[PDB]
């Protein structure tokens, strides 16, 4: 079950159970891959798993938000998903903090900004 795909993680963060996230650490190091490079993001737009978790909050809460960032932090690229933005012409520059604000979620904004989220990234 170490092997992971785009749609699997998309569904996992959609459901909102954090226990199923376990196992990503081994896979992210067996292939020497990072969550931003080519791991889990839609090719058409550039939309990543974090936003997929943030586009659906069950009554304004998602447990899966809590671990995943340090899942990036321990073994991630210099960009901590704040500089990872969609490459869709209609939707360029729109980062996860923008979803967090527009979803009217103050907690997500708190977590992102205290986890190193640049604010000068114009969408």
């Amino acid at each position: 079950p170490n092997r992971f795909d785009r749609d699997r993680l998309f569904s996992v963060v959609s459901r909102g159970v954090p226990e199923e996230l376990t196992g990503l650490l081994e896979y992210l190091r067996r292939t020497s891959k990072y969550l931003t490079d080519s791991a889990y993001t839609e090719g058409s737009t550039g939309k990543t798993c974090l936003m997929k978790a943030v586009l659906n909050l069950q009554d304004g809460v998602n447990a899966c938000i809590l671990p995943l960032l340090q899942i990036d932090r321990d073994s991630g690229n210099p960009q901590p998903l704040v500089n990872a933005q969609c490459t869709d012409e209609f939707y360029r520059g729109h980062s996860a903090l923008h979803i967090a604000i527009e979803k009217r979620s103050l907690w997500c904004v708190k977590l992102l900004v205290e986890n190193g989220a640049n604010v000068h990234i114009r969408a």
Side-chain angles (χ1 to χ4, degrees):
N2 289 317
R3 55 180 62 87
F4 281 159
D5 293 332
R6 318 271 187 176
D7 294 330
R8 189 268 185 190
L9 268 72
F10 278 9
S11 59
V12 164
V13 288
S14 304
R15 306 256 168 104
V17 296
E19 295 85 5
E20 293 192 332
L21 278 297
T22 60
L24 201 157
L25 282 76
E26 288 61 33
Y27 182 86
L28 205 66
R29 298 175 182 176
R30 68 183 65 249
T31 61
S32 67
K33 193 181 286 185
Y34 313 91
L35 289 174
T36 73
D37 203 337
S38 190
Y40 318 94
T41 187
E42 168 189 28
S44 178
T45 69
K47 168 257 186 181
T48 185
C49 60
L50 280 74
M51 294 182 286
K52 184 56 199 175
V54 176
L55 272 72
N56 45 4
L57 271 72
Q58 304 100 27
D59 288 330
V61 66
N62 280 328
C64 296
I65 297 169
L66 297 185
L68 190 153
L69 302 84
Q70 69 267 17
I71 291 174
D72 181 34
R73 186 177 65 246
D74 52 359
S75 60
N77 268 313
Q79 58 268 15
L81 276 297
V82 62
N83 299 359
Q85 330 190 67
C86 297
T87 59
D88 178 22
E89 194 285 313
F90 191 72
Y91 182 76
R92 292 183 186 271
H94 190 285
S95 177
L97 197 148
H98 298 65
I99 297 89
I101 290 193
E102 190 276 331
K103 299 289 94 175
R104 326 285 273 161
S105 177
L106 193 148
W107 173 32
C108 295
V109 176
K110 289 177 68 68
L111 268 178
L112 288 185
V113 65
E114 66 183 1
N115 285 39
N118 181 15
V119 194
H120 294 89
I121 50 173
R122 58 177 67 90

